[model samples]
Target: SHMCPAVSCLQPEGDEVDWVQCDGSCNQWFHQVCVGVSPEMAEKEDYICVRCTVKDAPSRK
Candidate 1:
C-alpha cells in the first residue's frame, strides 16, 4: 500500500480530507492542507510538487 505522502499526516484520515495531484513527473497525491496548497493552485497546469522540484533541480557543477 502507498502512503498518503503528505507531511501533515502520512496516513489518510477522515472523508473531509482532500487531495491535490502533482502535475510534475512524481505525480503523487498530497493533502491540500498538508502541502499548504488549495484548489486554486491545483487549477494551474504547472503545479509541481516539492519532491519533484528537488529531484528535477539542476545539479551544481
Candidate 2:
C-alpha cells in the first residue's frame, strides 16, 4: 500500500463521509467527491488511480 497523495486534507470527521480506495497498485484513498466517483459506481467496479492508469498505459513504439 502507498501513502495517500491527495492534496486536500478534507476527510470524514467521524465516518459520516463516504470514501473509497483505489483497487490498483497504488491503493491510495480518495473521497468520492474528490474523484467524482459515487458509491454505487465504485461498488460496481474496480478503481484504478489516474496516475496509475497513465503509468500503466502502453507507450508508443
Candidate 3:
C-alpha cells in the first residue's frame, strides 16, 4: 500500500488552527479549507468528511 493523508492535499497539515477530524470512520484529520469548512464551523459543527459521507454505511463487527 501507500502512505497518504485523508484529504491527499499538497501538505500533510495546515498552518492555521483551522482543522477538523472526521466523525464517521477514518478519524482522519483535514484542513477546514480542503474539507470546505470554515474555522467557525470547526468549533460548532460535527465534521464528517466525504469519505465517510460517501460510504453512507452503518456499523460493523
Candidate 4:
C-alpha cells in the first residue's frame, strides 16, 4: 500500500507478512521489512497516506 489516512483507518488485514503504519500518527500501510521495523514496533507508531506524506515531508514551517 502507499499510506494511511489516519490511525482509525489502519487495521491489520489477512496474514500480512511485513506491515508498517506508513508513519507514526495515522493508519497507513508499509512493508514490515521495508520499514526495517518489526510488526510490534510498527504498531507502536502512527501512519499517514501518500498525499499526507508529501504535504508533511517538507520541514515544518
Greater-lDDT candidate between 3 and 4: 3
Score candidate 4 by TM-score against the native: 0.31
Candidate 4 positional error at 37, Å: 2.7
Ranking by lDDT: 2, 1, 3, 4
C-alpha TM-scores of all predictions? 0.58, 0.60, 0.54, 0.31
Across 1-61, the per-residue lDDT of candidate 1 in tens digits comes to 3555655664445556767777677777766676777567756644687778787867772
Off by over 4 Å in 2: 1-3, 8-14, 59-61
Backbone N/Cα/C clashes per model? 0, 0, 0, 11
Where does model 4 exceed 4 Å of error? 1-16, 23-28, 38-40, 47-54, 57-60
Question: Of models 1 and 3, which has the larger lDDT?
Answer: 1
RMSD of each: 3.2, 3.5, 5.1, 7.4
Candidate 2 structure quality by residue, lDDT tens digits, 1-61: 1244776545556356667878766777776766778667778756677788887767672
User: Candidate 3, TM-score vs. the true structure?
Assistant: 0.54
**How much lDDT does each candidate structure score?**
0.66, 0.68, 0.63, 0.51
* Global local distance difference test of model 3: 0.63
Candidates by TM-score, descending order: 2, 1, 3, 4
lDDT of 4: 0.51
